[PDB]
phenylalanine dehydrogenase (Rhodococcus sp.), 697 residues
Amino acid sequence: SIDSALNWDGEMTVTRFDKMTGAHFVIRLDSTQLGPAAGGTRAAQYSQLADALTDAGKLAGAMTLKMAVSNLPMGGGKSVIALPAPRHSIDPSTWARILRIHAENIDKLSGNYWTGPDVNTNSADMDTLNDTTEFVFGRSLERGGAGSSAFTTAVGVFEAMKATVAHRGLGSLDGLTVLVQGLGAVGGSLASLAAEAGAQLLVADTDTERVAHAVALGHTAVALEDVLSTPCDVFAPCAMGGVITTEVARTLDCSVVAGAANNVIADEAASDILHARGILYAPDFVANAGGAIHLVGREVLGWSESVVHERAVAIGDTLNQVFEISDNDGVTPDEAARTLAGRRARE
Amino acid sequence: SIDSALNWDGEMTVTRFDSMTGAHFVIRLDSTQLGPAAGGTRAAQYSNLADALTDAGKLAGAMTLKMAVSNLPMGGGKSVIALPAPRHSIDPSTWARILRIHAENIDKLSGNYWTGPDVNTNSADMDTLNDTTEFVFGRSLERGGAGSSAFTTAVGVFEAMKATVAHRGLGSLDGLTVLVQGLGAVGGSLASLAAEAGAQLLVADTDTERVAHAVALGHTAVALEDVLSTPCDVFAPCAMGGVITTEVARTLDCSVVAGAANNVIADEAASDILHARGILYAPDFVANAGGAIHLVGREVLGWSESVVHERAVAIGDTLNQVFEISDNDGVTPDEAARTLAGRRAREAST
Ligand SMILES: NC(=O)c1ccc[n+]([C@@H]2O[C@H](COP(=O)([O-])OP(=O)(O)OC[C@H]3O[C@@H](n4cnc5c(N)ncnc54)[C@H](O)[C@@H]3O)[C@@H](O)[C@H]2O)c1
Ligand SMILES: O=C(O)C(=O)Cc1ccccc1
Ligand SMILES: O=C(O)C(=O)Cc1ccccc1
Ligand SMILES: [K+]
Ligand code: NA
Ligand code: NA
């Protein structure tokens, strides 16, 4: 919206336009209070620049909260590259220039922003960025980075889901129906984990093959148009953000929402409805923090893989703390998580 | 619109919004090719944020060329602070908060951008910025800065005016009529300079005190409504930019345009029109370069005051080169200036 695009209260917005590629670049540094801003690079198509600006600020603010609540010494930032065509349709040469320009932008911030992967960007892209700027996390193991953080994120989301299920009074995942929306790197692993835990998995993905494979594995497909109306115990959004609008919140037929997506909730009203409806939501910025713990933990703190897994597991404990505040103060899980974030950040 | 404002070819745009003060902040880095981007901080009210962005881009682009054509090893950048109220109304606390925020923004650029004064910002403000960030030119003398660059700018503009009048075949300033729009820091000195060289001055300013003072000095006041319709030999815009629109270029009644104002020409056609009508224009980015020569010369290059003075005087020579290319190649002075800028920059890199 105009407000989220222009009247954003974060510390800094960096924009650039490259006529040659037709790509627009946005970097939003929400906060550098706890340290340099850090957050991945999302590359996607947007209807209007306003949307790209809006998303960057929402994602950046989520990163600040995520580092805060996760006890990681970094601020929150995010880059959004507004593509002139579908990612898949971008030619190699064009993509390469795009990354080059993005790296130059990051470089000007001289360490006030550290990037990483996000939607449509990967370790190879991080490496390419690294060919021009030092401020990049998530480079391939071969190039010196921590590599993929997908599994770590999956672990964090899974533990989040277990803690939530337990708090909601459902006991364990065993015998629960979990609807995973998005069978990507993280969602795929999450499904595997929950299935191993005894849950029955309902899955949805825009990629046919992905779905058929899941089915091949014993899972059950859910048509796209049926996703939001399909009864389940847990709804696990692991695709795009903004899924839970007020209307969605009013009609979701589950008892827990716990997934990997960023900015899952469309507005505060949605969050209240869920609460009111007895649907326990595990706040995104808490639940999906595994990625950040992996990259920051490994690359900044020198933590081993085992340690980062351990810390990702502790996301369950953080959520238990979130739930306690929610229950005690009678506020939504999101509010409670913001409160915890502030307390941990020593605000 | 914002969308159109954002379709800018510069290297980087920095923006920020401070809800508490209601101020908007823009930093535009046009180029860092020749060195870190550098340019002043303009603080004013804008109708739309988009206008602030557009202004910043045009100002930043002029800085690129200015440094290049002036042989200064720096890129071009500019800051624009979109005020939530008339600058005068801004209480000291709010102003102080605005500057601190601006300083933080500059600071994140970590030296890829060096600021300085511009409209509504002064050496005191530079000192304040410097409380927070290192990348500031124009600090007070006490603070380690070179202070005001206004006189140096005036000297350069004056020399520019002389060169242009001469090139235009009008001879010397003595006896010529010069219209000085804006009797500010620069305009005031310029008026003094020209008057000393024998010019008859017509003056205008929104500050009535300023006008009276000039009249007291023997100058002739011009009503604001009349400024662009007043016949003169030389038109010296030393207030706001964009004065010379296409429409104004068609009717301007003077032989030379040479002032201190930034981005004097509103649209390209205006430039073409002045050229076609035989009104010799000394490009702003060349003519007003005394400010930059002073700041960069003093604070970066190690130049003495005398040398700075010499360099500013040399603006007339640069203009002579500009007009020379304009005449040979048949292009406008602005185009010839850009050409010269590009030559120098190469040479400067070669
Ligand atoms: N590149 C730079 O750093 C830079 C820095 C400062 C000034 N400048 C430029 O040069 C111009 C002169 O700067 P200055 O230091 O002398 O500024 P200044 O504020 O000291 O003086 C500007 C003068 O113009 C007057 N004015 C405003 N609107 C007017 C109008 N419509 N008609 C007549 N007078 C009007 C103001 O009242 C003031 O007396 C600036 O406005 C800007 O374009 C450039
Ligand atoms: O975890 C995320 O959502 C990201 O944005 C990836 C990331 C995390 C931490 C630092 C840099 C990038
Ligand atoms: O005189 C100018 O062009 C300025 O904008 C003031 C300034 C000059 C050089 C560097 C920074 C600011
Ligand atoms: K159960
Ligand atoms: Na703020
Ligand atoms: Na099954």
Chain A is about 45% helix and 15% strand. The pocket of 3-phenylpyruvic acid (ligand 3) is lined by residues B 38-40, 63, 66, 114, 116-118, 137, 149, 291-292, 295-296 (CB under 6 Å).
